[PDB]
Amino acid sequence: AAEYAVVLKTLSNPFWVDMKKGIEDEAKTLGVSVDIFASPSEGDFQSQLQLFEDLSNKKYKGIAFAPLSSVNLVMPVARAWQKGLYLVNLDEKIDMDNLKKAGGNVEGFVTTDNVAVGAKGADFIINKLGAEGGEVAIIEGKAGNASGEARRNGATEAFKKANQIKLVASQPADWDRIKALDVATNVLQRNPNLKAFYCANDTMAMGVAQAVANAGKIGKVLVVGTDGIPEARKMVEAGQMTATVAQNPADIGATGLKLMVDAAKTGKVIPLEKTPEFKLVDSILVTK
């Protein structure tokens, strides 16, 4: 068993594959051992709670964790803090009000500025649609995820400020490729004059881009994603997606691990009362 455990959402999403590799490479730089785990799919809330608990009860100094929902890991993360494990929240913000209520804390939280991610994707669309503007739609993450909520808020506020843009639809496809295909199909049907989708992640952006293709609207409806996964990058170069707001999962993982190891070296977990460390990882727009 390694000194440190990691719990990622799921390796069915390349974002988490790239975070795993970032963490493995950072461990070699710090000279520490990590055991990395994930859930089989996006919806395995219950399984992930049971996975965390079971890791919490081995001999790990620390756990870095990306929860599948704001709430699902609150109780086991509280228990791990109480037992004196060095905890780092990766990327998807744990409900900190409910964590405090449960008598827990984390050393730190590493994430992207996901309001700026939404703004950046929206701002690209606004500039591409020019003075004519027109109708836009947001394909959301699952409700009750801070990461998705920030991107929706960022893109919605950017759209709102452009008089020539109308946000006609803003609805979830739950980080799911097949749900995004079906939701985006419906949005195009309901809105024949749609000019653009902003999508809260690439898994969903690839479904949306399939929906746009099926309606024979490749190039006439913009598709902007989020993460910069390889298949989304290929689609952007091939002209099937317009753009993606690239994140750096490898850096979020490397940063998270270093925050956990740095904390562990102090020999005392964060006091219940203390604000956790907060580290942002940049995003960039990628177009063809």
Residues that bind ligand WEB (CB under 6 A): 13, 15, 66, 91-92, 147, 175, 201, 203, 226-227, 247
Side chain identity at residue 70, one-letter code: S
Nearest distance in Å: CB 201, ligand WEB: 4
Q: Which of 61, 53, 55, 67 is nearest to 87 (CA)?
A: 61
Nearest distance in Å: CB 265, ligand WEB: 26
Nearest distance in Å: CB 117, ligand WEB: 8
Side chain identity at residue 38, one-letter code: A
| Closer by beta carbon to ligand WEB, 3 or else 113 | 113
| Closer by beta carbon to ligand WEB, 210 or else 226 | 226
Burial label, 213 (beta-carbon count in 10 A; 0-12, 13-18, 19+): middle
User: Please, are residues 23 and 253 in contact by the beta-carbon 8 Å criterion?
Assistant: yes
C-alpha gyration radius of the chain = 20
Buried b (16+ CB within 10 A) or exposed e, 93-118: bbbbeebeebebbbbbbbbbebbbbb
Nearest distance in Å: CB 66, ligand WEB: 5
Q: Which of 111, 127, 117, 94 is nearest to 201 (CA)?
A: 117
| Closer by beta carbon to ligand WEB, 5 or else 146 | 146
| Closer by beta carbon to ligand WEB, 190 or else 278 | 278
Nearest distance in Å: CB 154, ligand WEB: 13
Sign of CA dihedral 103, 49, 175, 227: positive
Nearest distance in Å: CB 227, ligand WEB: 5
Give me the residue whose beta carbon is nearest to ligand WEB: 147
User: Please, are residues 249 and 90 in contact by the beta-carbon 8 Å criterion?
Assistant: no
Nearest distance in Å: CB 151, ligand WEB: 7
| Closer by beta carbon to ligand WEB, 15 or else 52 | 15
| Closer by beta carbon to ligand WEB, 123 or else 140 | 140
Q: Which of 231, 232, 147 is nearest to 197 (CA)?
A: 232
| Closer by beta carbon to ligand WEB, 195 or else 233 | 233
| Closer by beta carbon to ligand WEB, 56 or else 283 | 283
Number of H helices, E strands in the chain: 10, 12
Side chain identity at residue 71, one-letter code: V
Q: Which residues contact 110 (CB under 8 A, 6 or more apart)?
A: 88, 89, 90, 91, 252, 255, 256, 259, 279, 280, 281
Nearest distance in Å: CB 60, ligand WEB: 21
